[PDB]
Symmetry: C3
Subunit: 213 residues, 3 copies
């Protein structure tokens, strides 16, 4: 078993503390020396992002400039066809080999929607799922069958993440943040301060570019 690697996907419109901080602590809780962020272009499961692809990428770079834990993989931004996490993870698995523990990080709100993802069942064959807590979201799946799926792959010992290359779901004890890209976009539109919600470099870039206005 090689060193546990982690990937974190998202649209990040814009990237903010609710995306970053839970993950940074995750690295100290379970042991990650590197987290690859995988931004996407126009995900099917959601409306068009306000900031375009180039701007969202730049904001991510600005945000991790002084945080070596993070790096970017632009495969989904450059992909000509739409991307699917099941596909990106299949690829990562082939590239890294069968002995590299691999984990895909999501927030509690995305775990609730996981069973609706493209070929979701294949994801656990290629990687682990590490879920970060989000305040106020239900902890159990909406439907009984998907709750069973969850319990079927659930582990309470994060050590398991380092001992197998994939297959486990772990609900990490990460910090809570009542922060969303939506609230930030609206605060900016309303002329309310976002100073304590996302990196200064990102905020500054947002204002320089006139984004979300």
């Amino acid at each position: 078993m090689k060193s546990l690697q982690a990937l974190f996907g998202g649209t990040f419109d814009p990237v903010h503390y609710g995306h970053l901080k839970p993950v940074e602590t995750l690295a100290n809780l379970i042991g990650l020396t590197r987290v690859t962020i995988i931004p996407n272009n126009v995900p099917p499961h959601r409306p068009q992002p306000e900031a375009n692809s180039v701007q969202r990428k730049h904001m991510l770079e600005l945000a991790i400039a002084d945080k070596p834990l993070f790096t970017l993989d632009e495969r989904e931004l450059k992909r000509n066809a739409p991307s699917y996490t099941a596909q990106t993870l299949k690829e990562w698995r082939q590239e890294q080999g069968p002995d590299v523990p691999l984990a895909f990080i999501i927030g509690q709100d995305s775990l609730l929607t996981f069973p609706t993802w493209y070929e979701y069942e294949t994801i656990l064959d290629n990687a682990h799922l590490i879920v970060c807590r989000r305040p106020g979201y239900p902890l159990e799946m909406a439907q009984p069958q998907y709750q069973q799926w969850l319990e079927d792959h659930l582990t309470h010992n994060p050590e398991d993440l380092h001992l197998q290359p994939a297959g486990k779901i772990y609900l990490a004890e990460t910090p809570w943040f009542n922060i969303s890209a939506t609230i930030i976009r609206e605060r900016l539109q309303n002329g309310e301060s976002c100073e304590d919600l996302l990196p200064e470099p990102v905020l500054t870039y947002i204002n320089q570019q006139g984004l979300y206005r």
Copy 2:
């Protein structure tokens, strides 16, 4: 519910690691993007501080120059008259509004003396109380009537701090530090090293100013 905001009050004569480190970790444990420190100007529950308001402010700015989590609120500092936490928190609630979760952070030794504070019962109407562990101090209130008050407001699920505006007392699992401003002043008096107890820039300022000797 907006983002949980935290306040950290004290005299800081001088600010040292026992003040800062528990709060820095607290931010990563429960989710704080900003902690506003509120230094007072000669409080009623203790004698005059040796360093004056200008010096303690300076030492705090030196201690947090590198720590973006922190910012200062000099409302009690620049005020010559006596200040009371209950009044400060009442003002904070009025200013921030009813939907902002607000927490006032204190150490275990301060929790034990909490029932003697000016109109202490109004504090939980305006904010939550986050208590940082301190080695050696009792965990239970001296008098049963106050242990009951503690028990009636306690929560073991820090997520509560993010879902209600105020009212809970949470005993956080923060790092322990056998450090106090008194030990620091006394060691300086005996010409014993205080390296490892507070920031070097703070110690430098102290010697430059001739403070505590």
Copy 3:
């Protein structure tokens, strides 16, 4: 009880993230303002290091240059006679006084071998033992008698480390890392990347010196 101090010993051939990250997080979990790394030369319990004394020391200074938590103690590299942790801790105890809690940090793999150390029984008379988790290792001593010794000194309350000068063994809940110096040396020799396994500065020095590869 004065402030709890910690010592971290090892060969570090080379120092990597598996050595540092568990310890850095340890400082935030239990409360440590400083950890003194004690590198050794050619200890008898293991073969001769590939990298030499000055090289391993230089790699340590490079790795901690920007991590103020750490400092180096060169006594075991400068000592003429062979070094023994029991002796180094006896000296520390003598130098620090009887009221400083002292802790020596090791990984689970070393704890398993602890009963074979030179005068191992005297170590707990002089300091506490703090153990960092390591994935895949047995949690219990191989022989019942040493497991007895383990259980007899074991505490599940880390506050104990700050209230007594020595005597307890605490198994800290630190991050896991599938990293070893042996795998690094192999990889470098086979020309494979070691980018996410140890500090960039240390990798650079390794290349400059022609080490391992």
